[PDB]
Structure formats: C-alpha cells, structure tokens
C-alpha cells in the first residue's frame, strides 16, 4: 500500500525507514479549493517502534518527475510544511495555496506527496507473521479539514528462535547447556541491551542457558541464517564440536504453525562415557 518499510524483517535495535506516498494531490477536492494536505501518523508504542523525531524528508513530485523538497515552518507559503510531534506520533501539514478560498496555488497538476522518516525497533515488538496491531502504524492523508481517509498501514516484523536441547538417545530435555548465537558473517550475538541486538566478538557474546524445560528463547532477530554454538554441554554430556544451522524466514525448518519467523530447532547432546556407564 501507500505506507511501506525498507526491509521485510528487522532485528531489535534496527533503524526502520518508513515511506508514506500519496499520489492524488491536486488543487480541488469536490468543488472546494484545496489549501492544505494533512498527514497524520499514529505509530506503535515507543516500546515497540520509537519514532525518530526530526527524521522527515518531505517532497512533492509533479507529473514530469520534478521534485520540490519542503522545509519545516509555520508560514502559509510555497515549499513549506508544518510539523507537530507528540507521544511518538506526528502530524505534517503542507500548505497548498496562499489563501483558503478561491488562483494562488503553489503547485500545479497532479502531484505525489512523499514523507520518509525513521524509527528504531524496540524490545516490545512481537515476532512472527500473524496479524500484529502492536507492530503496526497507520498514516492518513486528507485535504483541508477532512478526516475521512481510511489510511495506509504497515507492520514491522521480526523473528524468534526457540532452542530445545535434548539427549539424542532418550530425547529428554536438558537444562544447563550454554549457547551463543552466531550470524552468517562471523559474529556473535550480544543482546545485553534488551532494546538492541548487536553482533561482535565471541568474548562479548550473550550466553544463554537452557532452562528447566530444556529451552532457550531468543526473540527479535532479522531473517537469515544463524548458527547455534554450544559453549557448555549439560552436566555429563560431551561438548558438541560443530554448530547447528538455523534458518529464520525463507527456507526455515521447524516452524510454528507454518510461520517461518517462529522457528524451533532441536539440538541433540551425546552422553559422555561416565553417564552411559
Ligand atoms: Ca525541482
Ligand atoms: Ca469525517
Ligand atoms: Ca544493533
């Protein structure tokens, strides 16, 4: 639709670039002179996507491709837009004519209004591919003082890996194993800032321990190929030599309800000699 984001999925802490596009901007609406367009954007909670205030680029593109880049201000004048930011939301008002009644229009023909801006994904975002109103924003664009536009929505997305650690023979769930997560580019996950996934050295990696249920949950990752690296085996088990590949997104296995952003790899462990005896 008319509201889009730059990536199909994100990791927590990533910059999300949003684009709002409105292609029907002309000088009359009904028989009424258009003297402004109002763009209102209601974002998710800032605990989910935190708007970067002041990040806007506002343009008008005419039918020939000519671009006018607008600048911020309250004056009713060509080349301007007014901004109000409150509560993680914003409203942009673009004056369209020098006066409100019949001329003194600033722009001619059929124009496209584009607003680009950014936000930052935070820890409250929900993972997966389902209907997620909490991850969704809505932008409306209306002439003059109308509020009838039903708006354009987009949902930011991320993924989750639920690791289950078992004994390869008995299939029992095993507590106390320690893993780190590696990406496809040689780096290790540091998720110590709960609002920001980071990738770096192994020494700086976050260590995850399998719980009483054998599980580790890592929530808030971009699609891609990851590798589960065992740092400590459960008590009595041999340390696994090699990592286990886990795909999140296209190509995923072990999905929950066919959702390739909710994956459930099982890692098998091998009892060490003393434990079979
Ligand atoms: Ca130009
Ligand atoms: Ca109305
Ligand atoms: Ca980051």
């Amino acid at each position: 639709g008319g509201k889009t984001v730059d990536q199909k999925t994100y990791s927590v802490g990533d910059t999300v670039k949003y684009t709002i596009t409105y292609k029907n901007a002309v000088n009359y609406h009904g028989t009424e002179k258009v003297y402004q367009y109002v763009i209102k954007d209601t974002m998710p909670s800032a605990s989910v996507v935190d708007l970067n205030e002041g990040s806007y680029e506002v343009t008008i593109t005419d039918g020939s491709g000519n671009i006018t880049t607008l600048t911020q201000g309250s004056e009713k004048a060509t080349g301007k837009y007014n901004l109000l930011e409150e509560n993680n939301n914003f409203t942009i008002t673009i004056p369209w004519a020098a006066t409100n009644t019949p001329d003194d229009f600033f722009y001619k023909g059929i124009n496209t209004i584009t607003v680009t801006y950014t936000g930052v994904l935070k820890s409250g975002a929900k993972p997966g591919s389902a209907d997620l109103p909490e991850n969704t924003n809505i932008a409306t664009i209306n002439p003059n003082t109308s509020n009838d536009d039903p708006g354009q929505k987009v949902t930011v997305r991320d993924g989750q890996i639920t690791i289950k650690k078992i004994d390869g023979s008995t299939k029992a769930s095993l507590q106390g194993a320690i893993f780190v997560l590696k990406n496809a580019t040689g780096q290790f996950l540091n998720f110590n800032d709960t609002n920001n996934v980071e990738w770096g050295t192994e020494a700086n990696a976050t260590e995850y321990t399998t719980g009483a249920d054998g599980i580790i949950t890592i929530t808030g990752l971009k699609e891609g190929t990851y590798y589960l690296v065992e740092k400590k085996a459960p008590l009595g088990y041999n340390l696994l030599d090699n990592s286990q590949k886990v795909i999140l997104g296209d190509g995923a296995t072990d999905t929950t309800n066919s959702d390739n952003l909710l994956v459930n790899p099982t890692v098998e462990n091998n009892k060490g000699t003393e434990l079979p005896s």
Side-chain angles (χ1 to χ4, degrees), residues 138-164:
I138 184 169
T140 61
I141 307 97
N142 286 280
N144 296 350
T145 60
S146 183
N147 73 338
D148 292 3
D149 178 41
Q152 302 293 316
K153 292 191 292 194
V154 71
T155 304
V156 296
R157 306 272 177 194
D158 69 16
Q160 177 180 87
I161 301 173
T162 301
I163 305 162
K164 183 170 65 188

PDB file of all heavy atoms in Angstrom, residues 138-164:
ATOM      1  N   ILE A 138      -0.301   3.544  11.302  1.00  0.00           N
ATOM      2  CA  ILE A 138      -1.231   3.982  10.280  1.00  0.00           C
ATOM      3  C   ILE A 138      -0.964   5.432   9.938  1.00  0.00           C
ATOM      4  O   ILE A 138      -0.755   6.252  10.821  1.00  0.00           O
ATOM      5  CB  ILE A 138      -2.713   3.795  10.711  1.00  0.00           C
ATOM      6  CG1 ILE A 138      -3.644   4.171   9.559  1.00  0.00           C
ATOM      7  CG2 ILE A 138      -3.025   4.572  11.958  1.00  0.00           C
ATOM      8  CD1 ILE A 138      -5.094   3.797   9.757  1.00  0.00           C
ATOM      9  N   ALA A 139      -0.947   5.741   8.650  1.00  0.00           N
ATOM     10  CA  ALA A 139      -0.845   7.112   8.188  1.00  0.00           C
ATOM     11  C   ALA A 139      -2.088   7.443   7.384  1.00  0.00           C
ATOM     12  O   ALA A 139      -2.484   6.691   6.509  1.00  0.00           O
ATOM     13  CB  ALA A 139       0.380   7.298   7.323  1.00  0.00           C
ATOM     14  N   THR A 140      -2.664   8.613   7.654  1.00  0.00           N
ATOM     15  CA  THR A 140      -3.770   9.131   6.859  1.00  0.00           C
ATOM     16  C   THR A 140      -3.291  10.407   6.168  1.00  0.00           C
ATOM     17  O   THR A 140      -2.468  11.160   6.722  1.00  0.00           O
ATOM     18  CB  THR A 140      -5.010   9.421   7.702  1.00  0.00           C
ATOM     19  OG1 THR A 140      -4.690  10.411   8.677  1.00  0.00           O
ATOM     20  CG2 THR A 140      -5.549   8.174   8.342  1.00  0.00           C
ATOM     21  N   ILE A 141      -3.846  10.668   4.987  1.00  0.00           N
ATOM     22  CA  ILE A 141      -3.592  11.892   4.268  1.00  0.00           C
ATOM     23  C   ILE A 141      -4.957  12.436   3.820  1.00  0.00           C
ATOM     24  O   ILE A 141      -5.705  11.735   3.131  1.00  0.00           O
ATOM     25  CB  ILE A 141      -2.668  11.687   3.065  1.00  0.00           C
ATOM     26  CG1 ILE A 141      -1.364  10.977   3.486  1.00  0.00           C
ATOM     27  CG2 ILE A 141      -2.425  13.045   2.378  1.00  0.00           C
ATOM     28  CD1 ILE A 141      -1.374   9.423   3.255  1.00  0.00           C
ATOM     29  N   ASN A 142      -5.251  13.669   4.212  1.00  0.00           N
ATOM     30  CA  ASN A 142      -6.556  14.279   3.917  1.00  0.00           C
ATOM     31  C   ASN A 142      -6.340  15.702   3.410  1.00  0.00           C
ATOM     32  O   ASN A 142      -5.468  16.423   3.910  1.00  0.00           O
ATOM     33  CB  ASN A 142      -7.403  14.388   5.184  1.00  0.00           C
ATOM     34  CG  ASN A 142      -7.972  13.065   5.652  1.00  0.00           C
ATOM     35  OD1 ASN A 142      -8.969  12.584   5.142  1.00  0.00           O
ATOM     36  ND2 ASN A 142      -7.328  12.465   6.647  1.00  0.00           N
ATOM     37  N   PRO A 143      -7.172  16.156   2.464  1.00  0.00           N
ATOM     38  CA  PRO A 143      -7.192  17.582   2.121  1.00  0.00           C
ATOM     39  C   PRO A 143      -7.895  18.369   3.201  1.00  0.00           C
ATOM     40  O   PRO A 143      -8.809  17.854   3.852  1.00  0.00           O
ATOM     41  CB  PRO A 143      -7.989  17.591   0.823  1.00  0.00           C
ATOM     42  CG  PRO A 143      -8.975  16.460   1.014  1.00  0.00           C
ATOM     43  CD  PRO A 143      -8.219  15.392   1.776  1.00  0.00           C
ATOM     44  N   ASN A 144      -7.525  19.639   3.315  1.00  0.00           N
ATOM     45  CA  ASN A 144      -8.269  20.607   4.120  1.00  0.00           C
ATOM     46  C   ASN A 144      -8.532  20.040   5.512  1.00  0.00           C
ATOM     47  O   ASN A 144      -7.570  19.665   6.185  1.00  0.00           O
ATOM     48  CB  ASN A 144      -9.504  21.083   3.352  1.00  0.00           C
ATOM     49  CG  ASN A 144      -9.116  21.838   2.105  1.00  0.00           C
ATOM     50  OD1 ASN A 144      -7.949  22.173   1.897  1.00  0.00           O
ATOM     51  ND2 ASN A 144     -10.107  22.149   1.272  1.00  0.00           N
ATOM     52  N   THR A 145      -9.788  19.998   5.960  1.00  0.00           N
ATOM     53  CA  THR A 145     -10.073  19.518   7.308  1.00  0.00           C
ATOM     54  C   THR A 145     -10.815  18.186   7.325  1.00  0.00           C
ATOM     55  O   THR A 145     -11.374  17.782   8.342  1.00  0.00           O
ATOM     56  CB  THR A 145     -10.840  20.541   8.125  1.00  0.00           C
ATOM     57  OG1 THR A 145     -12.079  20.836   7.478  1.00  0.00           O
ATOM     58  CG2 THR A 145     -10.035  21.814   8.283  1.00  0.00           C
ATOM     59  N   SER A 146     -10.789  17.459   6.224  1.00  0.00           N
ATOM     60  CA  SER A 146     -11.406  16.150   6.227  1.00  0.00           C
ATOM     61  C   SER A 146     -10.647  15.167   7.106  1.00  0.00           C
ATOM     62  O   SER A 146      -9.445  15.265   7.252  1.00  0.00           O
ATOM     63  CB  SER A 146     -11.465  15.588   4.821  1.00  0.00           C
ATOM     64  OG  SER A 146     -12.128  14.335   4.859  1.00  0.00           O
ATOM     65  N   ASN A 147     -11.361  14.205   7.689  1.00  0.00           N
ATOM     66  CA  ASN A 147     -10.731  13.069   8.365  1.00  0.00           C
ATOM     67  C   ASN A 147     -11.257  11.732   7.812  1.00  0.00           C
ATOM     68  O   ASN A 147     -11.179  10.714   8.498  1.00  0.00           O
ATOM     69  CB  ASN A 147     -10.879  13.114   9.902  1.00  0.00           C
ATOM     70  CG  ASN A 147     -12.276  12.792  10.367  1.00  0.00           C
ATOM     71  OD1 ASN A 147     -13.225  12.924   9.603  1.00  0.00           O
ATOM     72  ND2 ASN A 147     -12.422  12.360  11.623  1.00  0.00           N
ATOM     73  N   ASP A 148     -11.756  11.725   6.575  1.00  0.00           N
ATOM     74  CA  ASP A 148     -12.386  10.537   6.029  1.00  0.00           C
ATOM     75  C   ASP A 148     -11.421   9.519   5.413  1.00  0.00           C
ATOM     76  O   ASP A 148     -11.809   8.387   5.149  1.00  0.00           O
ATOM     77  CB  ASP A 148     -13.412  10.905   4.966  1.00  0.00           C
ATOM     78  CG  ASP A 148     -14.623  11.627   5.511  1.00  0.00           C
ATOM     79  OD1 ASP A 148     -14.745  11.939   6.707  1.00  0.00           O
ATOM     80  OD2 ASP A 148     -15.523  11.891   4.694  1.00  0.00           O
ATOM     81  N   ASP A 149     -10.168   9.889   5.170  1.00  0.00           N
ATOM     82  CA  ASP A 149      -9.235   8.940   4.565  1.00  0.00           C
ATOM     83  C   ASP A 149      -9.053   7.680   5.473  1.00  0.00           C
ATOM     84  O   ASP A 149      -8.744   7.811   6.637  1.00  0.00           O
ATOM     85  CB  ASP A 149      -7.849   9.566   4.390  1.00  0.00           C
ATOM     86  CG  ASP A 149      -6.854   8.590   3.799  1.00  0.00           C
ATOM     87  OD1 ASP A 149      -7.242   7.848   2.881  1.00  0.00           O
ATOM     88  OD2 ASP A 149      -5.684   8.502   4.236  1.00  0.00           O
ATOM     89  N   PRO A 150      -9.228   6.449   4.945  1.00  0.00           N
ATOM     90  CA  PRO A 150      -9.149   5.291   5.851  1.00  0.00           C
ATOM     91  C   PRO A 150      -7.685   4.939   6.182  1.00  0.00           C
ATOM     92  O   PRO A 150      -7.459   4.213   7.128  1.00  0.00           O
ATOM     93  CB  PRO A 150      -9.870   4.183   5.086  1.00  0.00           C
ATOM     94  CG  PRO A 150      -9.695   4.593   3.632  1.00  0.00           C
ATOM     95  CD  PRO A 150      -9.806   6.089   3.639  1.00  0.00           C
ATOM     96  N   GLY A 151      -6.731   5.498   5.436  1.00  0.00           N
ATOM     97  CA  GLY A 151      -5.333   5.362   5.761  1.00  0.00           C
ATOM     98  C   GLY A 151      -4.654   4.144   5.225  1.00  0.00           C
ATOM     99  O   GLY A 151      -5.260   3.237   4.657  1.00  0.00           O
ATOM    100  N   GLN A 152      -3.355   4.141   5.477  1.00  0.00           N
ATOM    101  CA  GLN A 152      -2.429   3.147   4.965  1.00  0.00           C
ATOM    102  C   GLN A 152      -1.601   2.633   6.143  1.00  0.00           C
ATOM    103  O   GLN A 152      -1.087   3.427   6.934  1.00  0.00           O
ATOM    104  CB  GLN A 152      -1.513   3.732   3.872  1.00  0.00           C
ATOM    105  CG  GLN A 152      -2.244   4.325   2.670  1.00  0.00           C
ATOM    106  CD  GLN A 152      -2.974   3.298   1.825  1.00  0.00           C
ATOM    107  OE1 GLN A 152      -2.439   2.224   1.527  1.00  0.00           O
ATOM    108  NE2 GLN A 152      -4.187   3.637   1.397  1.00  0.00           N
ATOM    109  N   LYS A 153      -1.481   1.316   6.251  1.00  0.00           N
ATOM    110  CA  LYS A 153      -0.830   0.697   7.388  1.00  0.00           C
ATOM    111  C   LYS A 153       0.357  -0.129   6.941  1.00  0.00           C
ATOM    112  O   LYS A 153       0.383  -0.633   5.809  1.00  0.00           O
ATOM    113  CB  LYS A 153      -1.803  -0.254   8.079  1.00  0.00           C
ATOM    114  CG  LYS A 153      -2.955   0.422   8.759  1.00  0.00           C
ATOM    115  CD  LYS A 153      -3.739  -0.535   9.643  1.00  0.00           C
ATOM    116  CE  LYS A 153      -4.478  -1.597   8.901  1.00  0.00           C
ATOM    117  NZ  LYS A 153      -5.464  -2.243   9.837  1.00  0.00           N
ATOM    118  N   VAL A 154       1.304  -0.334   7.859  1.00  0.00           N
ATOM    119  CA  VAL A 154       2.353  -1.314   7.636  1.00  0.00           C
ATOM    120  C   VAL A 154       2.746  -1.898   8.987  1.00  0.00           C
ATOM    121  O   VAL A 154       2.690  -1.211   9.997  1.00  0.00           O
ATOM    122  CB  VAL A 154       3.557  -0.721   6.835  1.00  0.00           C
ATOM    123  CG1 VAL A 154       4.341   0.248   7.691  1.00  0.00           C
ATOM    124  CG2 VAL A 154       4.452  -1.818   6.286  1.00  0.00           C
ATOM    125  N   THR A 155       3.129  -3.170   8.974  1.00  0.00           N
ATOM    126  CA  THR A 155       3.523  -3.897  10.179  1.00  0.00           C
ATOM    127  C   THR A 155       5.008  -4.232  10.113  1.00  0.00           C
ATOM    128  O   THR A 155       5.446  -4.881   9.170  1.00  0.00           O
ATOM    129  CB  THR A 155       2.708  -5.207  10.289  1.00  0.00           C
ATOM    130  OG1 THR A 155       1.296  -4.918  10.257  1.00  0.00           O
ATOM    131  CG2 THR A 155       3.073  -5.983  11.570  1.00  0.00           C
ATOM    132  N   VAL A 156       5.781  -3.772  11.088  1.00  0.00           N
ATOM    133  CA  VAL A 156       7.188  -4.164  11.148  1.00  0.00           C
ATOM    134  C   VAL A 156       7.270  -5.586  11.700  1.00  0.00           C
ATOM    135  O   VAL A 156       6.442  -6.007  12.510  1.00  0.00           O
ATOM    136  CB  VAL A 156       8.058  -3.215  11.985  1.00  0.00           C
ATOM    137  CG1 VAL A 156       8.107  -1.823  11.352  1.00  0.00           C
ATOM    138  CG2 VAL A 156       7.599  -3.208  13.437  1.00  0.00           C
ATOM    139  N   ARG A 157       8.246  -6.345  11.218  1.00  0.00           N
ATOM    140  CA  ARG A 157       8.333  -7.769  11.540  1.00  0.00           C
ATOM    141  C   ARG A 157       9.707  -8.166  12.041  1.00  0.00           C
ATOM    142  O   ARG A 157      10.724  -7.643  11.566  1.00  0.00           O
ATOM    143  CB  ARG A 157       8.027  -8.606  10.297  1.00  0.00           C
ATOM    144  CG  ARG A 157       6.748  -8.345   9.583  1.00  0.00           C
ATOM    145  CD  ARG A 157       5.663  -9.123  10.124  1.00  0.00           C
ATOM    146  NE  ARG A 157       4.361  -8.870   9.528  1.00  0.00           N
ATOM    147  CZ  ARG A 157       3.259  -9.291  10.096  1.00  0.00           C
ATOM    148  NH1 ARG A 157       3.326  -9.968  11.221  1.00  0.00           N
ATOM    149  NH2 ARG A 157       2.092  -9.010   9.573  1.00  0.00           N
ATOM    150  N   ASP A 158       9.728  -9.130  12.953  1.00  0.00           N
ATOM    151  CA  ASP A 158      10.957  -9.780  13.373  1.00  0.00           C
ATOM    152  C   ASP A 158      10.683 -11.250  13.679  1.00  0.00           C
ATOM    153  O   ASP A 158       9.538 -11.697  13.612  1.00  0.00           O
ATOM    154  CB  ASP A 158      11.664  -9.019  14.516  1.00  0.00           C
ATOM    155  CG  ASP A 158      10.951  -9.036  15.842  1.00  0.00           C
ATOM    156  OD1 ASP A 158      10.050  -9.832  16.097  1.00  0.00           O
ATOM    157  OD2 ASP A 158      11.389  -8.193  16.693  1.00  0.00           O
ATOM    158  N   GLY A 159      11.747 -11.993  13.959  1.00  0.00           N
ATOM    159  CA  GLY A 159      11.672 -13.422  14.164  1.00  0.00           C
ATOM    160  C   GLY A 159      12.144 -13.869  15.536  1.00  0.00           C
ATOM    161  O   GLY A 159      12.712 -13.098  16.314  1.00  0.00           O
ATOM    162  N   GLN A 160      11.881 -15.134  15.807  1.00  0.00           N
ATOM    163  CA  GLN A 160      12.212 -15.745  17.084  1.00  0.00           C
ATOM    164  C   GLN A 160      12.742 -17.159  16.881  1.00  0.00           C
ATOM    165  O   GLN A 160      12.185 -17.910  16.064  1.00  0.00           O
ATOM    166  CB  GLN A 160      10.970 -15.800  17.952  1.00  0.00           C
ATOM    167  CG  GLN A 160      11.134 -16.488  19.302  1.00  0.00           C
ATOM    168  CD  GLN A 160       9.849 -16.460  20.041  1.00  0.00           C
ATOM    169  OE1 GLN A 160       9.002 -17.360  19.876  1.00  0.00           O
ATOM    170  NE2 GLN A 160       9.653 -15.430  20.820  1.00  0.00           N
ATOM    171  N   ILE A 161      13.795 -17.492  17.624  1.00  0.00           N
ATOM    172  CA  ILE A 161      14.349 -18.837  17.637  1.00  0.00           C
ATOM    173  C   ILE A 161      14.128 -19.416  19.036  1.00  0.00           C
ATOM    174  O   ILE A 161      14.601 -18.859  20.032  1.00  0.00           O
ATOM    175  CB  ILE A 161      15.851 -18.833  17.313  1.00  0.00           C
ATOM    176  CG1 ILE A 161      16.119 -18.210  15.934  1.00  0.00           C
ATOM    177  CG2 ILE A 161      16.419 -20.250  17.395  1.00  0.00           C
ATOM    178  CD1 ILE A 161      17.599 -18.018  15.606  1.00  0.00           C
ATOM    179  N   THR A 162      13.420 -20.536  19.105  1.00  0.00           N
ATOM    180  CA  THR A 162      13.221 -21.284  20.339  1.00  0.00           C
ATOM    181  C   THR A 162      14.051 -22.563  20.235  1.00  0.00           C
ATOM    182  O   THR A 162      13.759 -23.432  19.409  1.00  0.00           O
ATOM    183  CB  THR A 162      11.747 -21.611  20.559  1.00  0.00           C
ATOM    184  OG1 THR A 162      11.001 -20.387  20.610  1.00  0.00           O
ATOM    185  CG2 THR A 162      11.531 -22.385  21.857  1.00  0.00           C
ATOM    186  N   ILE A 163      15.116 -22.642  21.029  1.00  0.00           N
ATOM    187  CA  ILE A 163      16.035 -23.769  21.021  1.00  0.00           C
ATOM    188  C   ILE A 163      15.597 -24.777  22.062  1.00  0.00           C
ATOM    189  O   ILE A 163      15.388 -24.412  23.213  1.00  0.00           O
ATOM    190  CB  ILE A 163      17.464 -23.304  21.364  1.00  0.00           C
ATOM    191  CG1 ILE A 163      17.954 -22.190  20.443  1.00  0.00           C
ATOM    192  CG2 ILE A 163      18.433 -24.487  21.325  1.00  0.00           C
ATOM    193  CD1 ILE A 163      19.172 -21.410  21.006  1.00  0.00           C
ATOM    194  N   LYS A 164      15.473 -26.041  21.667  1.00  0.00           N
ATOM    195  CA  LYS A 164      15.229 -27.121  22.612  1.00  0.00           C
ATOM    196  C   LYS A 164      16.421 -28.044  22.626  1.00  0.00           C
ATOM    197  O   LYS A 164      16.822 -28.580  21.608  1.00  0.00           O
ATOM    198  CB  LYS A 164      13.990 -27.937  22.283  1.00  0.00           C
ATOM    199  CG  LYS A 164      13.728 -29.025  23.354  1.00  0.00           C
ATOM    200  CD  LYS A 164      12.382 -29.727  23.211  1.00  0.00           C
ATOM    201  CE  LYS A 164      12.298 -30.536  21.928  1.00  0.00           C
ATOM    202  NZ  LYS A 164      10.926 -31.077  21.666  1.00  0.00           N
TER     203      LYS A 164
END
